[PDB]
Design a protein around this nucleic acid. Structure first.
Ligand SMILES: [Mg+2]
Ligand SMILES: [Mg+2]
Ligand SMILES: [Mg+2]
Ligand SMILES: [Mg+2]
Ligand SMILES: [Mg+2]
Ligand SMILES: [Mg+2]
Ligand SMILES: [Mg+2]
Ligand SMILES: [Mg+2]
Ligand SMILES: [Mg+2]
Ligand SMILES: [Mg+2]
Ligand SMILES: [Mg+2]
Lengths: 113, 56, 117, 130, 46
RNA sequence: GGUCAAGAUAGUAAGGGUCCACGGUGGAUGCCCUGGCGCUGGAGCCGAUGAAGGACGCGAUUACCUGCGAAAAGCCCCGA
RNA sequence: AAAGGUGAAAAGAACCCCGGGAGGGGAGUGAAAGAGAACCUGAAACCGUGGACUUACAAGCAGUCAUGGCACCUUAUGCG
RNA sequence: GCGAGAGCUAACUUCCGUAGCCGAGAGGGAAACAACCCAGACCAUCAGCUAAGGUCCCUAAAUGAUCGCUCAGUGGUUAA
RNA sequence: GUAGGGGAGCGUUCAGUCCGCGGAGAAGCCAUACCGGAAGGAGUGGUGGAGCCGACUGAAGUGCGGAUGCCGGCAUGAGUAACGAUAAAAGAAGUGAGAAUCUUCUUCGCCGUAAGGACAAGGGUUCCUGGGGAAGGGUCGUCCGCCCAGGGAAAGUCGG
């Protein structure tokens, strides 16, 4: 009867390379559309990461550099994206649900910054 | 290897299928584009969900 | 020359089938099962036909002794006193006479009493 | 009246509110399930529930619900605000067969069924009682 | 695993061949019999 | 006729059953002949002037059959 | 191996409508489209849709008999 | 069931003799129950008498009559 | 009343003869509460679109529930088990009637004495180009090794 933090859809390694990859893309696009699930999971993972970028030191930048493998996305989050949320108590990310799909019939959604 | 013993009847099978009735979506009129869409979701027609979101 | 079974089997089977009405499921629908049902149906028909007369025998008795017991006799006593009078070959269906007609069966009870003691 | 021969030429015999989709590769049993909620309701409502109902079967049932209303309006001069599904139903159809497999008892148990249409239909009509 | 049938052009031909089937007369028997049996064609075209 | 009490009693069908009505599926049955079957009779061998049976070709358009044959779905003479 | 059937005649359905289509609905032709090319009849299994009377304390070869209830009246107001 | 042999004076045993039934026998009785008890079904009936069996309620029919016996639920598990 | 013997008959096809019926509708098919001692046979209704009852005699490939019988069709299991290797995907962009599945971009993971490359044998246009979307594709499909058309293969020296 598990009472636990994480959900995985898949294996131990992939849960990461995914949450990393989708976080990278949200930061790059500013909103993306994915399954309601992957969205729901991605939400706090990306938020804790905006906070790593807030605070602005090289330490922080190099921490963010661990889940963000593209220098331009990390530069954006660090110099552009982080600061802009300043007076923000934390948690700008939000979940909008678009609707169902054809092939698999799976309800999808927008995660937006 | 554990096979069924008899053809199940027309009445028994139609009885088992008793529960398979689809539950029709409860819809609602969109306050903005006034076309029927669904709760806690974006109106596919106008794109408006509390103000406006998707490019329609 | 060759005579196929055409148009023969079908009429036959429909004839069989048609007896079947409130017949449940394949009994009323598939041939072989229907016809087969109509074998045991034969048994119960004829035999319970001879039986129905036993059944009504039972009913009428069950009524007559009831009226009797109501008036102080019983079937043994009532029919005894009845026969004891060469008078009543009444016998058959006397039940309804007891059911519908109170004072009549009172007179038959009293009378059959006279024919006893 | 006259005789049957004459009854045939005196009347063309129309079909009000009727249209049918033959031979849609789908399962009757399946399509039935969609079609059931549609049945007997306001034709607009019908188009909406049909919009949002997640079975893929729902689509060719939608494509038809219109085509029958379409016939109902244009061909039968009907009044669309009084329109509703009077009836609809799913009748099976000619189960699809390919060239193969043909072989007795050799790796022989498999489907190759690809079941028949269900035929769709939906007769449309006007409210009456209101 | 490895099947019964390992297709070979110079085999399917060196036996079964019209030439081959004509080499002996039990063969040519097979030939003309096959002919009268309807047109059942001999391996060079098969 | 209003609230207590004690009684009895209907109806609702998620789904099922029987009958009826109307479709669908299927292709039996009736009708039919473009195909067979054996009786009787007729006729009865072809091939080194290349058989039987085929291969590949021929056509404005040609994939199957038919018909032919680098003179190729044909060529010349006579008869109708 | 299975193998057949519009129609007397292609008159084989312009044109309109729903649809990418398939498919259908009109129009028109036709004696008939209750023949429309999944084109003679179209049985039975089998799948549905609508109606009638019914069924959610009852042990069951599915019937048979007997009485009551409800419904229907074209060999047919009862003999149903 | 009767008269024997085998057998253990066992067996829903086995082998003969003898009646009767089942076999090929429905109907009533013995809860159920081929053979046992009563009785052999041509057809119809919502008519009557009885057989074996029965007559408290589940089912038809004396919770009958007189004289007793048993106090064990014997009745409704065998003996020394 | 079982094997078995005997008697009367019912129905189906063909055949000869007789009476006939049919486009104001034949056979067949569908419903039915009537007739007959039974096999059965009528009446009216509904379909159907060419043929067909009845009587008398004759001849049979002449009467099906079973044969794990034959062919065909359609059920049950049931919307069940499965969708063919636990080398993962993700977002943007495009097209389109419709895209989780096609296209492009950016990443991610997998093989790398292979899961790269070149031949043989075998297969036979599967290659390329342009179209297509019924079936084939274990879902989808705008896509393909699928369907349509058109192109493409060049040797004194390579192999014969
Ligand atoms: Mg948990
Ligand atoms: Mg790892
Ligand atoms: Mg971390
Ligand atoms: Mg319901
Ligand atoms: Mg037809
Ligand atoms: Mg014995
Ligand atoms: Mg015997
Ligand atoms: Mg038999
Ligand atoms: Mg199961
Ligand atoms: Mg399961
Ligand atoms: Mg597919």
């Amino acid at each position: 009867h598990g009472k636990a933090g994480r959900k995985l859809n898949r294996n131990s390694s992939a849960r990461v390379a995914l949450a990393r990859a989708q976080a990278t893309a949200l930061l790059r696009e500013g909103r993306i559309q994915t399954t309601l699930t992957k969205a729901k999971e991605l939400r706090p993972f990306v938020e804790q990461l905006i906070t790593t970028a807030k605070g602005g030191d090289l330490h922080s930048r190099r921490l963010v550099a661990q889940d963000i493998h593209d220098k331009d996305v990390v530069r954006k989050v660090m110099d552009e994206v982080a600061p802009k949320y300043a007076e923000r108590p934390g948690g700008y990310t939000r979940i909008l649900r678009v609707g169902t799909r054809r092939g698999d019939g799976v309800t999808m959604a927008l995660i937006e910054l | 290897h554990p096979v069924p013993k008899k053809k199940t009847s027309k009445s028994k099978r139609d009885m088992r299928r008793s529960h398979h009735a689809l539950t029709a979506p409860n819809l609602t009129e969109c306050p903005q584009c006034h076309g029927k869409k669904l709760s806690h979701h974006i109106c596919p027609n106008c794109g408006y969900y509390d103000g406006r979101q998707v490019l329609a | 020359p060759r005579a196929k079974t055409g148009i023969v089997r079908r009429r036959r089977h429909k004839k069989v089938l048609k007896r079947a009405k409130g017949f449940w499921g394949s009994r009323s629908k598939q041939y072989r099962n229907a016809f087969q049902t109509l074998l045991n149906a034969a048994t119960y028909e004829y035999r319970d036909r001879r039986n129905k007369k036993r059944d009504f025998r039972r009913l009428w008795i069950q009524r007559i002794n009831a009226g009797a017991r109501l008036h102080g006799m019983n079937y043994s006593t009532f029919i005894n006193g009845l026969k004891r009078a060469n008078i009543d070959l009444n016998r058959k269906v006397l039940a309804d006479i007891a059911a519908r007609e109170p004072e009549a069966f009172k007179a038959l009870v009293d009378a059959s009493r006279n024919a006893r003691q | 009246f006259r005789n049957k021969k004459q009854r045939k030429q005196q009347v063309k015999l129309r079909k009000p509110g009727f249209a049918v989709a033959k031979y849609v590769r789908m399962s009757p049993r399946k399509v039935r399930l969609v079609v059931d909620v549609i049945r007997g309701k306001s034709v607009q409502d019908a188009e909406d529930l049909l919009r949002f109902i997640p079975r893929s079967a729902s689509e060719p049932v939608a494509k038809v619900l219109n085509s029958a209303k379409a016939n109902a309006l244009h061909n039968d001069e009907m009044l669309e605000d009084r329109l509703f599904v009077k009836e609809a139903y799913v009748d099976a159809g000619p189960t699809l067969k390919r060239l193969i497999p043909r072989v007795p008892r050799a790796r022989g148990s498999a489907n190759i069924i690809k079941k028949r249409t269900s035929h769709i239909t939906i007769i449309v009509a006007e409210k009456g009682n209101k | 695993m490895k099947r019964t049938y390992q297709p070979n052009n110079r085999k399917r031909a060196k036996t079964h061949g019209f030439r081959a089937r004509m080499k002996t007369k039990s063969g040519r028997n097979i030939l003309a019999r096959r002919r009268a049996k309807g047109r059942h064609q001999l391996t060079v075209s098969d």
